[PDB]
Structure 1
Amino acid sequence: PFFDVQKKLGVDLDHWMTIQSAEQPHRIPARCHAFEKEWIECAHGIGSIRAEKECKIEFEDFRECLLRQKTMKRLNAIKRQRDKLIKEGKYTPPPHHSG
Structure 2
Amino acid sequence: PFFDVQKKLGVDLDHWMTIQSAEQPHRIPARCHAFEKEWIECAHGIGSIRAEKECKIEFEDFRECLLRQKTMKRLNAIKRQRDKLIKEGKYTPPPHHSGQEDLRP
Both proteins in one fold, TM over 0.5: yes
List aligned pairs for 1:1-99, cutoff 5 A: 1-94=1-94, 96-97=96-97
Q: Could you tell me how far apart the structure 2 residues matched to 1:42 and 1:95 are?
A: 46
Listed one character per residue, the Cα deviations across residues 40-84 of structure 1 (whole Å, up to 9, x for unaligned) are 110001121110111001110110001000111011011111111
TM-score (norm 1): 0.91
> Counterpart in 1 of 2:102?
none
**Does the C-alpha gap of structure 1 residues 98 and 8 become closer, same or farther in structure 2, counting only changes over 3 Å?**
closer
Q: CA deviation at 1:92?
A: 2.6
Percent pairwise identity: 100
**Tell me, what secondary structure is at the counterpart of 2:26?**
coil
In structure 2, the gaps of 5 or more residues are 100-105
TM-score (norm 2): 0.86
Q: CA deviation at 1:98?
A: 6.6
Q: CA deviation at 1:93?
A: 2.3
In structure 1, the gaps of 5 or more residues are none
Q: CA deviation at 1:10?
A: 1.0
Greater Cα offset, 89-98 or 73-82: 89-98
Count of aligned residue pairs for this structure pair: 99
Q: Could you tell me how far apart the structure 2 residues matched to 1:91 and 1:17 are?
A: 50
